[PDB]
């Protein structure tokens, strides 16, 4: 079935939904094994994590909406998530393709959004050295802490993309 060309915004919308679908498949696999995403003591794994999240000051919610500050926050947030998506690559075999897809699709999305931004002056790029050490730190942990880290990343990334999707529909 044929259609007209997607606009930039429609392309972005479709990209986010594709990533969410992939995150969903990853979540399903994680929660069907090991601790079954039992989350009572997840605060323990959260200590080592600085996961991006929306706040009202970011201007991504309908109330207090601000297109410029929101877009900056989404791009900055997604750039910060990338080290955590790299972490996820080793945690899924029997789902290699899916974890790979989520990671690649997020990179494509970042580029779409950076095109939409111009300028990128307010965009804080995460430090590679800090990211390499963080990744090492996360991988060194025992299996239980790694299962919890995995679940926290998936949930938090899902939440960030859901809020991003809603905000980008207003742009």
């Amino acid at each position, epitope marked *: 079935p044929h259609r007209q060309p997607l606009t930039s915004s429609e392309r972005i919308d479709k990209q986010i939904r594709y990533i969410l679908d992939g995150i969903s498949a990853l979540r399903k696999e994680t929660c069907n094994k090991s601790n079954m995403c039992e989350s009572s003591k997840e605060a323990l794994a959260e*200590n080592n994590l600085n996961l991006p999240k929306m706040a009202e000051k970011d201007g991504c919610f309908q109330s207090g909406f601000n297109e410029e500050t929101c877009l900056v926050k989404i791009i900055t947030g997604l750039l910060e998530f990338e080290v955590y998506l790299e972490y996820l690559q*080793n945690r899924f075999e029997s789902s290699e393709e899916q974890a790979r897809a989520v990671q690649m699709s997020t990179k494509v999305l970042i580029q779409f959004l950076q095109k939409k931004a111009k300028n990128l002056d307010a965009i804080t790029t995460p430090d590679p050295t800090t990211n390499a050490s963080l990744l090492t730190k996360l991988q060194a942990q*025992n*299996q239980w802490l790694q299962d919890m880290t995995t679940h926290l990343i998936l949930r938090s990334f899902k939440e960030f993309l859901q809020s991003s999707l809603r905000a980008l529909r207003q742009m």
Partner: antibody, heavy 120, light 108 residues
Framework: EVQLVESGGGLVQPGGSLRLSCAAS????????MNWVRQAPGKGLEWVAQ??????????YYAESLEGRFTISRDDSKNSLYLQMNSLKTEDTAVYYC???????????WGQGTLVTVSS | DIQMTQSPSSLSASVGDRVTITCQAS??????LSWYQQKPGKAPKLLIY???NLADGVPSRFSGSGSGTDFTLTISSLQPEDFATYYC?????????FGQGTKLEIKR
């Protein structure tokens, strides 16, 4: 019952190499992380190395004090753990225990240990 | 690597007395610390796992406490079979680390 049995211990000259073995039985060896722990005569416990499973890409970790002289490996078809030791020094003289690592990280099962003596 | 400071190195106590052994981790390890008892000529025995959970068959006079960096093993009313060497294990992140050990001996 879970059983871990070490082999390959004994005397070795300073600078030498020795390969320890551990035969595991009574559980699905493949699923578990494994550790080596050592204890010099009359001294404290010293954690040595970790061997991870297939799910974790057979990752390996070592105590830093070992300075890369040791290599851990496993053979899942034989239910066996190995510790290849190189450039041995007299301070490596110890009982070496094979051990099963918990999901949670703590050591849950231990072998009886095998003595390695480094000496001329 | 995470360093462990176990205290004291040696302890002399009477049967029926109460003792505490402390371990400090060089960084936050959550509750991922366990306590081991070792008798001469034997492999170590797990007493307390994940800071405060008693291992199967371990008498309730043994109790573990703490979270973060500071941890305590308490033994109430020492019995003769409890005199041994005790070790904490940091099992948060590899390489794992044992404390230096506490040798607990009977006062007579």
């Amino acid at each position: 019952e879970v059983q871990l049995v070490e082999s390959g211990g004994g005397l070795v000259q300073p600078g030498g190499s020795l390969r320890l073995s551990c035969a595991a039985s009574g559980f699905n060896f493949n699923d578990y992380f494994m550790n080596w722990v050592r204890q010099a005569p009359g001294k404290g416990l010293e954690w040595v190395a970790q061997m991870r499973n297939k799910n974790y890409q057979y990752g390996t970790y070592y105590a830093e004090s070992l300075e890369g002289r040791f290599t851990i490996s496993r053979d899942d078809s034989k239910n066996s753990l190995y510790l290849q030791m190189n450039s041995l020094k007299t301070e490596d003289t110890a009982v070496y225990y094979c051990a099963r690592e918990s999901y949670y990280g703590f050591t849950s099962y231990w072998g009886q240990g095998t003595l390695v003596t480094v000496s001329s | 690597d995470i360093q462990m400071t176990q205290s004291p190195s040696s302890l002399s106590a009477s049967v029926g007395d109460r003792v505490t052994i402390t371990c400090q981790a060089s960084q936050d390890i959550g509750i991922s610390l366990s306590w081991y008892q070792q008798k001469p000529g034997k492999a170590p025995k797990l007493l307390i796992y994940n800071a405060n959970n008693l291992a199967d068959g371990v008498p309730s006079r043994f109790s573990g406490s703490g979270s973060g960096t500071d941890f305590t093993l308490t033994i109430s009313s020492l019995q003769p079979e409890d005199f041994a060497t005790y070790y904490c294990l940091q099992h948060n992140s590899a390489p794992y680390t044992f404390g230096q050990g506490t040798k607990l001996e009977i006062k007579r």
